[PDB]
Structures are given as C-alpha cells and as structure tokens.
Amino acid sequence: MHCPFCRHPDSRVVDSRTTDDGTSIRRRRQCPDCSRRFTTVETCSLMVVKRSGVTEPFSRTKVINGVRKACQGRPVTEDALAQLGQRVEEAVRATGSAELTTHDVGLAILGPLQELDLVAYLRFASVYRAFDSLEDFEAAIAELRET
Amino acid sequence: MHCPFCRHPDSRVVDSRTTDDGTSIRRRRQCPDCSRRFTTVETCSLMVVKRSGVTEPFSRTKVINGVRKACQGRPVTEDALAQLGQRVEEAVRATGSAELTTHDVGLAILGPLQELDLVAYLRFASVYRAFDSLEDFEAAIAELRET
Amino acid sequence: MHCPFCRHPDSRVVDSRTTDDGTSIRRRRQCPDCSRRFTTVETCSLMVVKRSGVTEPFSRTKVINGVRKACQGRPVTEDALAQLGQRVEEAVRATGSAELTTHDVGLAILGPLQELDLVAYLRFASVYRAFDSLEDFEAAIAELRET
Amino acid sequence: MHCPFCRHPDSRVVDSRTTDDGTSIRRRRQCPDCSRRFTTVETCSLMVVKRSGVTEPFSRTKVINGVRKACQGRPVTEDALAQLGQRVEEAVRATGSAELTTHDVGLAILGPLQELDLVAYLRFASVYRAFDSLEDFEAAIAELRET
Amino acid sequence: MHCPFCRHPDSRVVDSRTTDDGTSIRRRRQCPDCSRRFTTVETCSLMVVKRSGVTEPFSRTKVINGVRKACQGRPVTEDALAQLGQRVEEAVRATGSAELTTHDVGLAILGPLQELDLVAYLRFASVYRAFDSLEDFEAAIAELRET
Amino acid sequence: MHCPFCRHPDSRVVDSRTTDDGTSIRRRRQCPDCSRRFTTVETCSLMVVKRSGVTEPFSRTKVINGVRKACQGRPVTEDALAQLGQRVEEAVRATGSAELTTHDVGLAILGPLQELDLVAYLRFASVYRAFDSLEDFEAAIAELRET
Amino acid sequence: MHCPFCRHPDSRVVDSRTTDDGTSIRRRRQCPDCSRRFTTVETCSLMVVKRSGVTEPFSRTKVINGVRKACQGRPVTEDALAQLGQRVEEAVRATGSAELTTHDVGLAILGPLQELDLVAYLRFASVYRAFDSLEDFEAAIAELRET
Amino acid sequence: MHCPFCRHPDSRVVDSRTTDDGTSIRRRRQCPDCSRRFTTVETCSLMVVKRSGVTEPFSRTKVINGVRKACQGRPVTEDALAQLGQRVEEAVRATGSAELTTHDVGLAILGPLQELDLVAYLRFASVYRAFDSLEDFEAAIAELRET
Ligand SMILES: Nc1ncnc2c1ncn2[C@@H]1O[C@H](COP(=O)(O)OP(=O)(O)OP(=O)(O)O)[C@@H](O)[C@H]1O
Ligand SMILES: Nc1ncnc2c1ncn2[C@@H]1O[C@H](COP(=O)(O)OP(=O)(O)OP(=O)(O)O)[C@@H](O)[C@H]1O
Ligand SMILES: Nc1ncnc2c1ncn2[C@@H]1O[C@H](COP(=O)(O)OP(=O)(O)OP(=O)(O)O)[C@@H](O)[C@H]1O
Ligand SMILES: Nc1ncnc2c1ncn2[C@@H]1O[C@H](COP(=O)(O)OP(=O)(O)OP(=O)(O)O)[C@@H](O)[C@H]1O
Ligand SMILES: Nc1ncnc2c1ncn2[C@@H]1O[C@H](COP(=O)(O)OP(=O)(O)OP(=O)(O)O)[C@@H](O)[C@H]1O
Ligand SMILES: Nc1ncnc2c1ncn2[C@@H]1O[C@H](COP(=O)(O)OP(=O)(O)OP(=O)(O)O)[C@@H](O)[C@H]1O
Ligand SMILES: Nc1ncnc2c1ncn2[C@@H]1O[C@H](COP(=O)(O)OP(=O)(O)OP(=O)(O)O)[C@@H](O)[C@H]1O
Ligand SMILES: Nc1ncnc2c1ncn2[C@@H]1O[C@H](COP(=O)(O)OP(=O)(O)OP(=O)(O)O)[C@@H](O)[C@H]1O
Ligand SMILES: Nc1ncnc2c1ncn2[C@H]1C[C@H](O)[C@@H](COP(=O)(O)OP(=O)(O)OP(=O)(O)O)O1
Ligand SMILES: Nc1ncnc2c1ncn2[C@H]1C[C@H](O)[C@@H](COP(=O)(O)OP(=O)(O)OP(=O)(O)O)O1
Ligand SMILES: Nc1ncnc2c1ncn2[C@H]1C[C@H](O)[C@@H](COP(=O)(O)OP(=O)(O)OP(=O)(O)O)O1
Ligand SMILES: Nc1ncnc2c1ncn2[C@H]1C[C@H](O)[C@@H](COP(=O)(O)OP(=O)(O)OP(=O)(O)O)O1
Ligand SMILES: Nc1ncnc2c1ncn2[C@H]1C[C@H](O)[C@@H](COP(=O)(O)OP(=O)(O)OP(=O)(O)O)O1
Ligand SMILES: Nc1ncnc2c1ncn2[C@H]1C[C@H](O)[C@@H](COP(=O)(O)OP(=O)(O)OP(=O)(O)O)O1
Ligand SMILES: Nc1ncnc2c1ncn2[C@H]1C[C@H](O)[C@@H](COP(=O)(O)OP(=O)(O)OP(=O)(O)O)O1
Ligand SMILES: Nc1ncnc2c1ncn2[C@H]1C[C@H](O)[C@@H](COP(=O)(O)OP(=O)(O)OP(=O)(O)O)O1
Ligand SMILES: [Zn+2]
Ligand SMILES: [Zn+2]
Ligand SMILES: [Zn+2]
Ligand SMILES: [Zn+2]
Ligand SMILES: [Zn+2]
Ligand SMILES: [Zn+2]
Ligand SMILES: [Zn+2]
Ligand SMILES: [Zn+2]
C-alpha cells in the first residue's frame, strides 16, 4: 500500500495481527522510500443485500437520503440526519455481519428515527414496511404510543 | 407583433409548431424591417403563486414528482400518476383563475390522489400539510374514514 | 390550441388583437367541443445570448442557482432567492428585448443582490465579473461602500 | 480474519487488488469452514469529524469540489486543483492524527490555495469562514497583504 | 427449490415482491441447510429468437424504442406508444407460443401501428423490412391503400 | 401474478411443483377474470459476485460489451457477439450456482471466444487476466498454440 | 494564445490581417518563451438557429447522427456517413452566414443524401419535413423520380 | 471582420474570453452597421484527415479515450493518460503540418504510450493496426524487445 508519507508504489507488511473478535486485521508496514512506518486497519466491506438479492456496498448516504425523504418540511436539520445515519451505521457494524439485508438496515433506522421525528418515522415506516392501508398506519401509531 | 429588436408593427410568422401536450404553440416570426427571426410561444398562462410569493408557470412535472414521492412503494404505475397530473392540470386550468396559489394546486391534487391511493394521500397530506405530531395523522385518518 | 375546458385537438381563433407596446398578442378562441371561450396571451420567448453566442431560453432557475451558489452559508432563505429570481426576470422582461446577453442578466442580478446579501454579492461579482486579483475585490468593496 | 458469517479464526486471501491512488487494498478471502467469499478493504483510516460531530472517511472529491467551486471563473486547470487536493491529503495523513476535524481539513486546503489563486482563496475563505460582512473580507485581505 | 449452493430439497420463501407491470414475482428464499438467502424470479418466459438465432427475454422497452424512432416528428404521445407496446406484449404472450422469432414481434407491432400512425408505419416498415428501393415504399403504400 | 390474458391484479396458484434438479419451480395459476390458466417458471436470479464482492444481477449485455471491446475492428459481427453472449450465459446457468464470480464468467467467455476471434481473445485475456508484461502475452500465445 | 511549441500562458499578435471575403482573420503571433512564430486563423462560430430559436454551435455529429438514424439497415458505411456530414458542413460554411436555420441544414443534407441512399433520403425527409400522410411520401417519391 | 449578416468591413470586439487549455479565444463582436453580436473563435487549425478522408479538428478527448481503452486494467492514472494526450497534441501541433492524417496521430501516441505502459502499447497497437493473427502480436513484441 502506497505510503502516506512517501507515495511509494509498493510497500511490505512488517507486522500483521488479528484484532479482538477478528473484525479487523492490524497491519503495520514500513515504506522503502522515506522509511516511515504506517499502520493500517483491514476490515470487511459492509454489504447490504438488497431486496433483489444484490449485495451493494453499505452507504450511509442512502440511509440519510431515505430518512431525509421521510423528513420533509420537518424540524430536522442536516446535522440530525447525519447523526442518525452515523447511528445506523454504528449499529449495523456492531451487529458484526458483513452482509445485512435492507430489512435489517430499515429496522436500525426505525428505532432511533422515533427520537428524531415520530411523524417522519411514520412516513419512513409507510414506505419501508409498505403499509397497505390506513389500518397499517393506525397499527403503527398504536406501537409508537405503546412505549 | 412589434419586433423586439426594432419595434416594427408587423412581423410575419415564418413557421409555427405546436406542443402536443403543451398548450403552447412555438412560432418563428420574421420582421420585415431588420430581417431578424424571433421566437414566440403562445400559451394560456397558468401561473401559480408559490409559498414564497413568487410566480411560476404551472408545470406538470412538479405535480408528477410530488405524487411519485408520495406513492413510492405503493403500486401506482407511472401511467396512473401521469393521469393524476393531467387531471389536476385540467381541473386548475378549468377553474379559470389563471393565477392560483400552490395551495390551490395542492388541494386540486389531493382529491384525485384519495381515489388513486390512500397511503399516498396520507404521505402526500403529511408532507404538504405540516403534520407536526401523530395527532395530525389521526385527524386526517378520521377525515378519510368519514368519506 | 387545445381547450382548457374541453381538450379538443384543434381550435379556431375568434379574436386576435395587439396589446399595448406589442409585447404580446391577445388571442381569444372558441372551442368546438364544449363551446367555452378561452383567452390566451402570445408573448416572445425571452432568450439569453450566452457568452458563447448560444441563445438559450431564459430560465430564472439558472439565475436562482447562481445566486444560491453565491449565497452559501448565508442568512438568505429559499424564499429570498426565489424573490430575487422573480425580480431579475421582471427587470429583464421590462427591458423589452427578446435576447439579453448574460452580461445584462448578471447586471440585473447584481443591483438587487446587494439588498439580499452584500457578501453574497461579492462572491457573485467575483465569479461573474471574473475578478482577476484582490485589487478587483477591493474595487468592488469600494463601489459597495460608495452608495 | 474471523469469517464474518461463522467466525472461523483463519481465512485465506483468494485475491488481492490494490487501489492505485487509494491507500486501499481490496482482498477477496475464502473461509475454509463455510466456503464463502468475503471482501475486505485495507486502509489507514483518515476520518474527519464533520461540523455535525459525525465521522466520515477523508475523501479527495470533497476537497476537489470545494476548490473547484472557489476557483470557478479563475484559470485553475482541473489538474492544478487535483494537485491541491493530493497535496492536502498528503499533509493531513502526514500530521498523523488519523482523526481530524474538518476545520483542520479547511486550514490544510487554504495555505496551498493561497499559492494556487488569491481570488479563489478569498472565495474559499468567504464560504468556509462566515464572512458575515464586508469587514471580514477586508480583514482577510489585510491578512493576505501581510504575507 | 433446491438451494443453488448446497442443493437442499426444501427452501422457504422469506419474502416475495411482485413486479406491478412485470409478470415477474421476486422472492427471497432461505435454505435451512446452509442458511443463505437467494433470490428467484417467477415469470412466464416470452423468449424471442433474434435474427442472429440467439434468445432474449421479451422486453417492452425494445418495442417502445422501435416505435418511438418510427414516430419521431409524428404526434404520437409517449402514452400512446406505451399502449402500443402493452398491446403488442398482450398479443404475443396471448399467441401462447412462449418462444417466438422477432419477425413475429415485428408483425405484431405493425398492425396496431397502422391504427396509431401511417407515416410511422411506413417508417417502421421501411426500417423493419429492407425497402432497398422506392418500389418497396410504393408496394407498401399500395398495401396500405388496399386496407 | 397478473394474468397474461386478463391483466387481473391478483391470481391464485392452483399448481406448484418442483422441476428436475430443483433449478426451477413450475407454477400454473388460474386467473379470476377471464378464467384462462397460465403456467410460469420460478427460477433463481443468476448473480455475479463482482471482484469487489458486489453481487450484481447477471447480464449478458455486460459480457457482450466486454467481448465487443475486445473485438474492435475485427471480422466479428453483432450476431456473433450475441451468440457468444448466449453461449456464456448458457454455460454459466448450466453450472447451476446462483452466484458466479466474475472470474468464472471470464473463463466461460474465454474458451468459446477463441473460436470467434483468437486475436480478440488476446485483447480480452490481457484486460481480464491483467497481463503484467509481454511475458504474459507470450505465455497466452503459447497456450493458444498448445491446442 | 498559448504557443503550440512553448506552452507560454500569454503571447502577442505580431501580425493581423483580413482574409479574402473577410470570413477569417489571419493572426501570426510570436511566443516569448521559445521564440517560435505560429500562425492562427480566426473564424466565425457556425451557429445553427434551432427551430425553437436556440442558436446552438454547429456540429456535424448531429447531422451524421440524424442521417444514420435515416440510414438504418442500409448499405451505407460509417465512412459514407462521415463524408456526407463533411459535405453538409462544407456547403453550409460555403453559404457564408454565421447562423443557419435547421431548415437550411436539412436542405443541405437532403440533396447529397439522394446519392448515398434514396430510401434513407425518404426516411430523413419524412421526419425532417414532417410528412403528414402517405400523400407526402408519394409527393416525395415523385420529386426523386423527377430528376 | 466582415459581418457575416451584412458584410460590413469593420466589426468591434465587444468581448474576448480565451480557452485555458484550448488554443481558442472566443470573441463577441459588434457590427456597427446592423448592430448584431456575432461569436468568433480564434484557433490554429489542427485538422486530422480521418481514414474516411474527412477532416476533423484535432480533439484531445479522442486520444484520451483511445488511451484509456488500451489501458483498461493497467495502472495508468487518469492524470498520466491526460499527460500522454497533452504530449501528443504538443508533438503534432509542433510538427507544424496543420493538416495531418490520423495515421500520424496514431504514430504520435504510440511512442509515448511505450513509456507509459507496454501492455497498453500492445493493446493500442493491436486495435490501431490490424493484428489479424497472433503473428502480428509476436512481430510487435519482437519490435518492443529490440528497443
Ligand atoms: N446499499 C445500501 N447501503 C446502505 N443502506 C442502504 C442501501 N440500500 C438501501 N439502503 C437503505 O436501507 C433501507 C431499506 O430500504 P428498502 O428495504 O425499502 O429498500 P430496497 O431493498 O432497496 O427496496 P426496493 O428494491 O424495493 O426499492 C432504506 O433506508 C435504504 O435507504
Ligand atoms: N410550478 C408549479 N407548477 C405546478 N404545481 C406546482 C408548482 N410548484 C409546486 N406545485 C405543486 O403545488 C403544491 C405546493 O406544495 P407546497 O405548499 O408543499 O410547496 P411550495 O408552495 O412549493 O413551498 P415550498 O417552499 O415549501 O416548496 C405541491 O403539490 C406541488 O407539487
Ligand atoms: N439561459 C439562461 N437564462 C437565464 N439566466 C441565465 C441563463 N444562462 C445563464 N444565466 C444567468 O445569467 C448570469 C450570467 O452568468 P455568466 O455570464 O457568468 O454565464 P455564462 O455566459 O453562461 O458563462 P460561461 O459560458 O463562461 O460559463 C448568471 O447568473 C447565470 O446563472
Ligand atoms: N468527508 C470529507 N473528507 C475530506 N474533506 C472534507 C470532507 N467533508 C468536508 N471536507 C472539507 O473540509 C472543509 C470543511 O468545510 P466546512 O466547515 O465549511 O463544512 P462542513 O464541516 O462539512 O460543515 P457543513 O455542515 O456546513 O457542510 C471543506 O474544505 C470541505 O471540502
Ligand atoms: N428482446 C426483444 N424483446 C422484444 N421485442 C424485441 C426484442 N428485440 C427486438 N424486438 C423487436 O422485434 C422487431 C425485430 O426487428 P428486426 O428484425 O429489424 O431486428 P432484429 O431481429 O433485432 O435484428 P438486427 O440484428 O437487425 O437488430 C423490432 O420491432 C424490435 O423492436
Ligand atoms: N453483473 C454481471 N453480469 C454478467 N457479466 C458480468 C457482470 N459484471 C461483469 N461481467 C463480465 O464478466 C467478465 C469478468 O470481468 P472482470 O472480472 O474483469 O470484471 P470486474 O470484476 O467487474 O472488474 P473490475 O471491478 O476490476 O472493473 C467480463 O467479461 C465482464 O463484462
Ligand atoms: N446544432 C446543430 N448543428 C448542426 N446540425 C444540427 C444541429 N441541430 C440540428 N442539426 C441537424 O439539422 C437538421 C435539421 O433537423 P430538424 O430541423 O428536424 O431539427 P430541430 O430543429 O432540432 O427540431 P426539433 O426541435 O423539432 O426536434 C437535422 O439533420 C439535425 O440533425
Ligand atoms: N478527431 C481526432 N482528433 C485527434 N485524434 C484523433 C481524432 N480521430 C481519431 N484520432 C486518433 O487518431 C488515431 C486514429 O486511429 P484509427 O486509424 O484506428 O481510426 P480512424 O482513423 O478514426 O478510423 P476508423 O474509421 O476505423 O475509426 C487514434 O489513436 C485516434 O484516437
Ligand atoms: N417518498 C418517501 N416518503 C417517505 N419515506 C420515503 C420515501 N421514499 C423513500 N422513503 C424511505 C423509506 C424507504 O424504505 C427508504 C429508502 O427508499 P428507497 O428509494 O428504496 O431507497 P434505497 O436507498 O433503497 O434506494 P434504491 O433502492 O434505489 O437503491 O426511504
Ligand atoms: N418525501 C416525500 N414524500 C412524499 N411526498 C413528498 C415528499 N417530498 C415532497 N412531497 C410532496 C408534498 C409537496 O407538497 C410536493 C412538492 O414538494 P417540493 O419538494 O416542495 O416540490 P415543488 O413542486 O413544490 O417544487 P419547488 O417548490 O422547488 O418549485 O410533493
Ligand atoms: N462558486 C461560485 N461562487 C459564487 N458565485 C458563483 C459561483 N459559481 C457561480 N456563481 C455565480 C456567478 C456566475 O456568473 C453565476 C452563474 O454561474 P454559472 O455556473 O456560469 O451559471 P450559468 O447559469 O451561466 O451556467 P451555464 O453556463 O453552465 O449554463 O453564478
Ligand atoms: N459556492 C461556493 N463558492 C466557493 N466555495 C464554495 C462554495 N460552496 C462551497 N465552497 C467551499 C467552502 C466549503 O468549506 C467547501 C465544501 O463545502 P460543502 O458544500 O459543505 O461540501 P462538503 O465537502 O463539506 O460536503 P458535506 O458537508 O455535504 O459532506 O467548499
Ligand atoms: N431510425 C429508425 N427509424 C424508424 N424506425 C426505426 C429506426 N431504427 C430502428 N427502427 C425500428 C425498426 C426496427 O425493427 C426496430 C428495432 O430496431 P433495432 O435498432 O435493431 O433494435 P432492437 O429492438 O432490435 O434491439 P437489438 O437488436 O439490439 O436487441 O425499430
Ligand atoms: N479496452 C479493452 N480491450 C479489450 N478487452 C477489454 C477492454 N476493456 C474491457 N475488456 C474486456 C476484458 C474485461 O475483463 C471485460 C470487462 O471489462 P470491464 O470494463 O471490467 O467490464 P464489466 O462488465 O466488468 O464492467 P464494470 O466492472 O464496470 O461493471 O472486457
Ligand atoms: N427515426 C428516424 N428515422 C429517420 N430519420 C430520422 C429519425 N429521427 C431523426 N431523423 C432525421 C430527420 C431529422 O430531421 C434529423 C434530426 O433528428 P433530430 O432528432 O431532430 O436531430 P437533432 O440533431 O435536431 O436533435 P435535437 O433536436 O435533439 O438537437 O434526423
Ligand atoms: N477496445 C479497445 N481496446 C484498446 N484500444 C482501443 C479499443 N478501441 C479503440 N482503441 C484505440 C485504438 C484506436 O485507434 C483508438 C481510437 O478508436 P476509435 O474507437 O475509432 O475512436 P476515434 O478516436 O478514431 O473516433 P472516430 O473515428 O469515431 O472519430 O483507440
Ligand atoms: Zn514512506
Ligand atoms: Zn425588427
Ligand atoms: Zn372547450
Ligand atoms: Zn466462515
Ligand atoms: Zn443451501
Ligand atoms: Zn386471465
Ligand atoms: Zn513558443
Ligand atoms: Zn452587420
């Protein structure tokens, strides 16, 4: 890997160790140009198994865009949207699995989303859960009232 | 019409092409004085007053995009929502005001969207109107039960 | 032109008259389907002769987008941006010419822009006037201070 | 590393492709237990803390877009600003913090942009910093005269 | 169905979403043996044999693009040609062959396009069939007069 | 699934059986509108695990585009390209696995490709196998000569 | 203008003369870096006044694309299409006017087009002249037969 | 220069903007006779004669796209190939012919591409030259060994 301090095309791994739980590998490497050691973390690519079976790369941008579509004309700032996206990403990586279904990401969005805007939660749950009729919205309203 | 460049009282229509869905006919006109083409568009002016007080031409695609956002995840085909939009344009041009607030446009879209989809109506009403709390969604639900 | 009340493919002009100053033609027409008269205004297409010589259609959307690029992180709402765009469009159509250069539109933006945000004016004048060095910004600051 | 799906302590690197400009090496790894490919990306983590408090990977294109917006209408070639961005990434990875606020990123870009272009520096400083009134532009101008 | 990865005779349908215009239902299925999602699509197979002898799924957009190219400059609205395409798909699925040459598809489109537009029919027939000389256009014209 | 003959929104499965090897499920269904039975095949979505780990849907269009990039200025017709794409798709589905790596698809392209154009094979193998230097091309030339 | 031989940012015009008919200006310039003189031609930008009044830059690519749309499945090579585009461009620049209407470009395409493919001429005239019904095609066939 | 619309011997340059990478300066000029803006572009004319015998302006992006296609899967960064293209334009403008066949352009690109990448040279030489059989690739390989 190209040295952050010397831009060398090639570098050698002088240390490679497994991190706790093995969710990452710590690889320190010595460059041959400026001889400055640099450490790197090798982590699994978080994949989202879309509902068509496509495993796209995980992107908090899509999560934030969906929540923003739910949060239209609401007292929800871009800072709050970014914080919710970060919380969703942190939860789904703390789950540990490399591939999460879009259903899991939707659930990870929903439980925090109640705190940012309960009404935005309703618009997000309606599109995400594919609420068939007002019975589904009334059921969703019930659950929001039940704790 | 007066040439826009030299103000000659007469100007002949070299060519005239209509818009098939647009109530606009685009005409290329020659001015006999300076011999300069100029393009004119003939259209009944539906001009909506936005919430900012500015005036914009009544555009189909704005209504289309609003309905599509409301209908995401509901079965409305691109053809059905295009029809909703055609129906709304026909209704608002019909009212014959020629200068209507976008509040009137929103009211025009909602009555057809109740027929097209109720989850979309709640999602369109939720974004269009404020819907600050779940109480607004319950009041709107009550309103849709009434009918 | 298709009737706003009857959707007929073809209609006949039963009255055509020239408006004051000839900036528009008033054409009333009778439809053959529902026999409801409708009046229309035939106006020149406002063209913007871009600095490459291309005469694009006038669009206040481009004006508002440019001003918004100038108005980044400022206390300038979308309502204010739309109002400035409307003012620019009104000024350039009150000029009367069908083709205005981008320089004319830039000037029509600049004089109102001082009222919405003087600092945004500086960022808009710097890109628009192609301010070569800080001497140009100091000269622009002088003019803003000189009335 | 532990397979993300069954947690097997050893997992062989089927393939490994580096990113030429990216300090990222993408590796496909097989798990001997469940025989399932999984993708890992090895990268020193430059993670900027946004103004919202969220954490994002240090992206070249954000710096590139910021500089390009500042330079619009100034002669900076796409190559020169790409270099500015490379220089900024080299400087911030160098500082060796591995977790820097976007304020640090903004300061990193400004010193090179003063060399690249002064109209751009004022336009970048104007947008980056608040610049509420012309007084901020005069203070910054004074600062650039000093140097 | 047999899991594609371990061939387990039974596999439960975790989820099933239909295509609204597509005669395709997309199902996510779990295999109890290896616990791996897999996506299946359920569709009557209209499979056209191209002029090259290859087999392709019967796609609406191919017919739509062919008709639109034929109709360029003729008044057919995007809705009318979409209908022509729907009508053609209904006719060819109806014939019940399930494996038809694109010659059959071309014949299916031409009879409806004669109703939709005659300039388009000559332009579609001209491109579809060879039409080497003006004599082919006169023969086709004679054929359209006959009817 | 919407009836091919009656367009009904909903239909019921009146027969569902597993095909030989379980690569598909045969589902015959009776519509409620025109009461015409229609049979459908439910098959796994062929997924291509890209070299980044993304499992895109299998598309012979990408295969044909890559081969066409290899087959530049060659005596290889579009019919031959489509036939090669069909052969590759048939081979990869006869493999039976739902997910094939891009390496497997590349191999399935390479062995037939020798028959369509050996020189195009060289250009496809060089990009696909990432031939480092002329030693790799000489080795590839050797294998083409060795049967 | 940047020297072709020294890449200098600025150069001075050491000779500027008007060419015959004034369709171009011959400007020879001496660079200050490598002191190598280079001559340049300053010509008017050929503008095409589109049928909407927009004056786009002239592009033979659009002409060739339109002719290619007419020349579908014909014995007309890409070399012939490029030659026809060059002939059209040469004719329209030999006309001398800076702005030509799309009608003039269409006429300049039509008369040569008869030589490349008379049948393609018919498909190009039908879209371009907006042939209303088979009477227009029969009239076009007559003119092609009349010399 | 003579006005293109009325042929007035003198026409003043209202404005003049250069192209930074382009050897083109775009000037808006007023004609005192008819008072009509017109746009002129001043450029040394590199005009390549294609294999079809037609003449096209020497475009950077054609060389860039040719090199990028040759380099796909080889490490050449978008910056390196942009440089190759700049170097080729500098070499061909330098030769001072002002009218060169695209064969000369191809020869100009190949000598730099040998330095940039040998797999790309074989892939560029393979597509550029015919390379009917593996014997052409062996002859070219021999040629690259020689050097
Ligand atoms: N690749 C991805 N990475 C991260 N989040 C994603 C990704 N794709 C979708 N999401 C988010 O996960 C949530 C799940 O959305 P949802 O399941 O409705 O989408 P989907 O599976 O793409 O649906 P559809 O295919 O029907 O459009 C949404 O908030 C969506 O924005
Ligand atoms: N130019 C337009 N032409 C036609 N319909 C429009 C136009 N602009 C908005 N509408 C429609 O009218 C309605 C107005 O909705 P709403 O009041 O929420 O927005 P708004 O007036 O544009 O204000 P905001 O600044 O919040 O966007 C929507 O249904 C929208 O699709
Ligand atoms: N077609 C248009 N209609 C209305 N306003 C426009 C149009 N094109 C540009 N403008 C606006 O007019 C102003 C003039 O901008 P400016 O002269 O710098 O642009 P330009 O001529 O397009 O420049 P360039 O070609 O160098 O990018 C800007 O605010 C721009 O947004
Ligand atoms: N993810 C990122 N990676 C690298 N640089 C970034 C990233 N995000 C922002 N930057 C850069 O760092 C600087 C931060 O600027 P600034 O403080 O104005 O924006 P911000 O922190 O993103 O806040 P805001 O919410 O206002 O956009 C800019 O120069 C920007 O280009
Ligand atoms: N995959 C497809 N699905 C449905 N209809 C198709 C498909 N491919 C082609 N068609 C349609 O069937 C007709 C076949 O036309 P035609 O015989 O000219 O082309 P072709 O068989 O694709 O051969 P070519 O190689 O010349 O393109 C056209 O009307 C086309 O739109
Ligand atoms: N989704 C797909 N469906 C079918 N074929 C595909 C798909 N993606 C790629 N292919 C084809 O499979 C072959 C394998 O190509 P290759 O492995 O070089 O691509 P890749 O994995 O996408 O590479 P990269 O990510 O480095 O660009 C190519 O012929 C490519 O066109
Ligand atoms: N900017 C341009 N430069 C050169 N040729 C052009 C340009 N625009 C159009 N043409 C060509 O000129 C001819 C005239 O075509 P035509 O008049 O039907 O197009 P148009 O005016 O763009 O029509 P429409 O606006 O109705 O789509 C066509 O062959 C077209 O490809
Ligand atoms: N307009 C152009 N300006 C500059 N370079 C060009 C231009 N057109 C082609 N070239 C370049 O010159 C070389 C010519 O290659 P080649 O002989 O294979 O193609 P050609 O002359 O365009 O013929 P063909 O009809 O086969 O495309 C290529 O390297 C190409 O990138
Ligand atoms: N119009 C809407 N109103 C409210 N919430 C919405 C709306 N559209 C989307 N959402 C919410 C709920 C959806 O499950 C979530 C993601 O929407 P969607 O468009 O499927 O995003 P995505 O990221 O999955 O996109 P894609 O499938 O195109 O990759 O965002
Ligand atoms: N995410 C959403 N989900 C559901 N409906 C939505 C969503 N976003 C917007 N809508 C609906 C309600 C709004 O009244 C309507 C149009 O909203 P908006 O985004 O303001 O566009 P607009 O047509 O008003 O454009 P503009 O105001 O910029 O001219 O669409
Ligand atoms: N980054 C910027 N900061 C401040 N003002 C800007 C910025 N970019 C543009 N502007 C302002 C001044 C410009 O003259 C005006 C229009 O910019 P520009 O991108 O040329 O718009 P335009 O509408 O002319 O676009 P185009 O030429 O692409 O059609 O907006
Ligand atoms: N119109 C503009 N003119 C000049 N500079 C600008 C303009 N807009 C932004 N900039 C500069 C100053 C900002 O600090 C920098 C980046 O701004 P911004 O639009 O917030 O993107 P970003 O990189 O911070 O992305 P995000 O915050 O969405 O992740 O670019
Ligand atoms: N320029 C044109 N004008 C009129 N009709 C056209 C034109 N080009 C094509 N068509 C018509 C006649 C053809 O039979 C039909 C489809 O043509 P084609 O371009 O071969 O696409 P296709 O649907 O066959 O795709 P493919 O063969 O690549 O799968 O469209
Ligand atoms: N310039 C080229 N010359 C010869 N063969 C090529 C060229 N480019 C690509 N190929 C061949 C070999 C490659 O493995 C194959 C696919 O190329 P690539 O662009 O990676 O396609 P892809 O379908 O994988 O695209 P993507 O990765 O963007 O989805 O095509
Ligand atoms: N389907 C077609 N079959 C035959 N000739 C066609 C077809 N489509 C276009 N043509 C011919 C006649 C048209 O006048 C000419 C240009 O078509 P058009 O799409 O208007 O091109 P253009 O270059 O004017 O595009 P645009 O208006 O989008 O800039 O090409
Ligand atoms: N798939 C490819 N792999 C490698 N090099 C390629 C590939 N395709 C083209 N090239 C190279 C060799 C060609 O001489 C050069 C340009 O090819 P080409 O596609 O004819 O474009 P061009 O620049 O000649 O445009 P045009 O002839 O249409 O004006 O690029
Ligand atoms: Zn180093
Ligand atoms: Zn006049
Ligand atoms: Zn009527
Ligand atoms: Zn495992
Ligand atoms: Zn299994
Ligand atoms: Zn039925
Ligand atoms: Zn020089
Ligand atoms: Zn003149």
Residue numbers in the entry:
A (entry chain D), B (entry chain C), C (entry chain B), D (entry chain A), E (entry chain G), F (entry chain F), ...: 1 to 147
Pull text from the paper.
NrdR, an RNR-specific repressor, controls the transcription of RNR genes and, often, its own, in most bacteria and some archaea. NrdR senses the concentration of nucleotides through its ATP-cone, an evolutionarily mobile domain that also regulates the enzymatic activity of many RNRs, while a Zn-ribbon domain mediates binding to NrdR boxes upstream of and overlapping the transcription start site of RNR genes. NrdRs (140–220 residues) consist of an N-terminal Zn-ribbon domain followed by an ATP-cone domain and in some cases a C-terminal part of variable length and unknown function. In contrast to all earlier suggested mechanisms, we show that the NrdR monomer contains two nucleotide-binding sites, one inner site that binds ATP and one more exposed site that can bind either ATP or dATP.
The structure of dATP/ATP-loaded NrdR in the absence of DNA (3.1 Å resolution) reveals an octameric complex composed of two tetrameric assemblies. Apart from a slight adjustment of the angles of the Zn-ribbon domains the two tetramers in the octamer are virtually identical to the tetramer that interacts with DNA. Tetramers competent to bind DNA are locked in an octameric form in which the Zn-ribbons of two tetramers face each other. The octamer would therefore need to dissociate to bind DNA. PISA analysis reveals that ~3700 Å2 of SAA are buried in four distinct small interaction areas between tetramers, compared to ~8550 Å2 buried within each tetramer. This implies that interactions between tetramers are significantly weaker than those within tetramers. The predicted free energy of dissociation of about –13 kcal/mol suggests that the octamer is unstable or marginally stable in solution, thus liable to dissociate into tetramers. This oligomerization mechanism may provide an additional layer of regulation by controlling the concentration of tetrameric NrdR, available for binding the promoters.
